[PDB]
Amino acid sequence: HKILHRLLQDS
Amino acid sequence: HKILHRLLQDS
Amino acid sequence: SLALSLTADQMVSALLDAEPPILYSEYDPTRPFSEASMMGLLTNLADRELVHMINWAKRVPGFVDLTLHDQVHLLECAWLEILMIGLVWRSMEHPGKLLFAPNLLLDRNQGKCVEGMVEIFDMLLATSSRFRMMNLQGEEFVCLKSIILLNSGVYTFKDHIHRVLDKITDTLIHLMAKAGLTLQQQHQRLAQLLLILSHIRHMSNKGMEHLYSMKCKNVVPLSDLLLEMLDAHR
Amino acid sequence: SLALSLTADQMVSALLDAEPPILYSEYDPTRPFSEASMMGLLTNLADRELVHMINWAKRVPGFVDLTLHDQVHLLECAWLEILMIGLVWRSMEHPGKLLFAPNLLLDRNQGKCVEGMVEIFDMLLATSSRFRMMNLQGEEFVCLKSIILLNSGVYTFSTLKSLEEKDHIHRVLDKITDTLIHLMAKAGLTLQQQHQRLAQLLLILSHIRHMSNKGMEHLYSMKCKNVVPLSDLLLEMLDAHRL
Ligand SMILES: Cc1cc(-c2ccc3c(c2)CC[C@@H]3O)cc(C)c1O
Numbered sequence: 086h087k088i089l090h091r092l093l094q095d096s
Numbered sequence: 097h098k099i100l101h102r103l104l105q106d107s
Numbered sequence: 108s109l110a111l112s113l114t115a116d117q118m119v120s121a122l123l124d125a126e127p128p129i130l131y132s133e134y135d136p137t138r139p140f141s142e143a144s145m146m147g148l149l150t151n152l153a154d155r156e157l158v159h160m161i162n163w164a165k166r167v168p169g170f171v172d173l174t175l176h177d178q179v180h181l182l183e184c185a186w187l188e189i190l191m192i193g194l195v196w197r198s199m200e201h202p203g204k205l206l207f208a209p210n211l212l213l214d215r216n217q218g219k220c221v222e223g224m225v226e227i228f229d230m231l232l233a234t235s236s237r238f239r240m241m242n243l244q245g246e247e248f249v250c251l252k253s254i255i256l257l258n259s260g261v262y263t264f265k266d267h268i269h270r271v272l273d274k275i276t277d278t279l280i281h282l283m284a285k286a287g288l289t290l291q292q293q294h295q296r297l298a299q300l301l302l303i304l305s306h307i308r309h310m311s312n313k314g315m316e317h318l319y320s321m322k323c324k325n326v327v328p329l330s331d332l333l334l335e336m337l338d339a340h341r
Numbered sequence: 342s343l344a345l346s347l348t349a350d351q352m353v354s355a356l357l358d359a360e361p362p363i364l365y366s367e368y369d370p371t372r373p374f375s376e377a378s379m380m381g382l383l384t385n386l387a388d389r390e391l392v393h394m395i396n397w398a399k400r401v402p403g404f405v406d407l408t409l410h411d412q413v414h415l416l417e418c419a420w421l422e423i424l425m426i427g428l429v430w431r432s433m434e435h436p437g438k439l440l441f442a443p444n445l446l447l448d449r450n451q452g453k454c455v456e457g458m459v460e461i462f463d464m465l466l467a468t469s470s471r472f473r474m475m476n477l478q479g480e481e482f483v484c485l486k487s488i489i490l491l492n493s494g495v496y497t498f499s500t501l502k503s504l505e506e507k508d509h510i511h512r513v514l515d516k517i518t519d520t521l522i523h524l525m526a527k528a529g530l531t532l533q534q535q536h537q538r539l540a541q542l543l544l545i546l547s548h549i550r551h552m553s554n555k556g557m558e559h560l561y562s563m564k565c566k567n568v569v570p571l572s573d574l575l576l577e578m579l580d581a582h583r584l
């Protein structure tokens with residue numbers, strides 16, 4: 086899990 | 097004082 | 108990949124349009140700063156800027172064509188270089204000072220407020236001076252920041268990234284040719300610009316060690332996101 | 342100002358003639374490695390290479406025009422980058438291995454014998470692999486190595502005359518850029534391909550800086566552990582970075 090993952094997938 | 101100084105100086 | 112089909116002028120327009128905003132510091136008016144207050148302001152600002160950086164990176168032509176894991180790798184490798192080149196860029200019109208935000212303009216004496224910060228301040232100020240002496244243009248700046256993003260982590264993984272990098276090179280030369288530089292002036296300026304990226308790398312690695320030391324010193328809690336980007340270097 | 346009068350072809354000949362030799366280690370292959378012993382071989386070698394590097398630097402055009410203080414500063418900043426690019430260069434034709442010495446060719450599995458070396462080992466291998474895929478030429482390598490010497494410390498140099506020193510260094514750097522373009526145009530590359538390859542080569546210097554920064558932290562770690570012998574010169578060079 087990574088915050089970076091979420092930010093990159095989100096807008 | 098520095099070795100590097102001396103090696104740069106040495107002739 | 109749509110990035111390779113763009114003209115130089117289209118590439119410049121896309122990168123200029125992708126630019127993140129300039130954020131403000133929390134409007135703490137209390138001067139001078141302490142170590143903890145300056146650290147609080149800078150880490151809070153860095154953390155908010157990181158969110159905008161990630162969304163800027165998605166708008167760099169060619170970056171979305173990469174897989175998620177490759178995007179993660181490049182941003183984990185380059186994030187502090189990117190924050191730093193952005194800080195140096197906006198500090199160009201403030202010689203001798205670092206414009207961390209419009210309401211947070213600091214000189215090198217204020218760098219001493221944080222243990223180990225003044226060495227990094229001096230390197231950032233030196234980079235800003237070099238940009239100013241070169242009369243770095245905003246169009247050149249956006250090219251360099253995108254180069255950092257694509258280049259810094261690419262040797263720790265490729266062909267697609269190198270083609271985009273080649274396209275940004277073409278775009279830098281195009282800008283210089285438009286400004287009337289002769290061929291010899293063009294390749295000399297291209298080298299001068301790209302050699303500063305080696306100094307930005309050095310500053311980032313020095314800054315990463317300093318952030319790690321502030322983490323261990325535990326003066327201020329770092330955000331989970333800032334810690335995740337920091338942990339990717341240790 | 343001898344450096345400013347050289348032609349591209351004369352710059353290359355000067356740099357080629359100044360190349361230091363490739364030195365041997367004390368490696369004895371009739372016994373298995375160990376962390377302390379392997380690192381002792383490498384630091385012994387690096388110390389001996391450093392002496393040759395210091396005398397090579399004197400032969401890089403323009404370097405002798407600088408002050409002694411500025412020569413010291415540039416070498417203090419650049420020495421590990423220069424050792425590393427040299428290592429990567431002589432390892433080019435040995436895929437998957439680092440040729441530390443003619444009698445010492447290691448793959449990443451043996452480099453794991455030292456804690457934390459494996460990451461640096463992998464980065465050096467990746468750099469050697471990149472030089473191979475670019476087919477880096479010996480003429481281009483000596484140009485890059487001289488760029489590292491003049492560039493890596495220049496942005497951490499007060500005075501109107503102080504600007505003359507940096508400006509002279511930047512004019513020499515400019516001459517080496519001229520020399521790289523000359524070599525590529527002679528090799529048949531179009532204008533576009535020349536600028537592309539120039540950029541590709543200079544961007545590798547960002548990775549070499551990164552490896553040197555990491556290697557310097559690892560060197561400081563070895564000093565603290567006080568297990569591998571480090572020479573007096575290596576310790577002075579190391580201390581110049583933790584200033
Ligand atoms: C705590 C800390 C922060 C920074 C830093 C913080 C914020 C920002 C930048 C660098 C660039 C622009 C942005 O505003 C650097 C070091 C070394 C630090 O130790």
Ligand SMILES: Cc1cc(-c2ccc3c(c2)CC[C@@H]3O)cc(C)c1O
Nearest residue numbers: 383386387424425428441556559560
């Ligand atoms: C990680 C590391 C590498 C080296 C090093 C790097 C390159 C080379 C040598 C030693 C010897 C042959 C070659 O020139 C040295 C120290 C102190 C290091 O800490």
